[PDB]
Amino acid sequence: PQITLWKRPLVTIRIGGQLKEALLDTGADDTVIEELNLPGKWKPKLIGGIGGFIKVRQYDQIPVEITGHKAIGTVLVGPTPVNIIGRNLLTQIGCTLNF
Amino acid sequence: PQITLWKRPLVTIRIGGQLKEALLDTGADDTVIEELNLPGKWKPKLIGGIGGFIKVRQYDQIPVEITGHKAIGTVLVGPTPVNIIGRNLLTQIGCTLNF
């Protein structure tokens, strides 16, 4: 699709069999979802943003369906204010910025 | 132009006459620049993100040229590793997400 930016670019995703809402975020290196369990192994990681650093769980090789488009990659789980889809998965679905 | 997301989408902007590097950020409601020495009136604001909140100075009606495309609007000034062009100015340059 083509998404304008008058509102936050929130979309529905599928992860771990569940539906969630998430923000398509060109300013994020990584994909960060609120606290939940995902299948498999994870290891601790720290990531930063405005406000500083937080601790997250790093899950690798997680399938995520983003507005109908498939990705498989790293998902970080922790206390983010909004679920965000970062560049690690935006690249997989072929997302670009255009003007 | 078209900006892919293999790396952070850093572009040249012009603000207060000066060329700087900033991230085109669809996950940002606001534009956040570290330029602590603008003239002009400002008011305090708090903005949040992945680590919590920070204090910033809100400047209104500031011209910001982004890759040759002119914009004018609110710019928040505060500590940040990365200057951020948010949706308040991305909409003015007709930016969209596409996949």
Binding site: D25, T26, G27, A28, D29, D30, V32, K45, I47, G48, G49, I50, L76, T80, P81, V82, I84, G86 | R8, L23, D25, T26, G27, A28, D29, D30, V32, I47, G48, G49, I50, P81, V82, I84, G86
Partner: peptide, 6 residues
Amino acid sequence: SLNXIX
């Protein structure tokens, strides 16, 4: 890892 503003 840097991750972006609300």
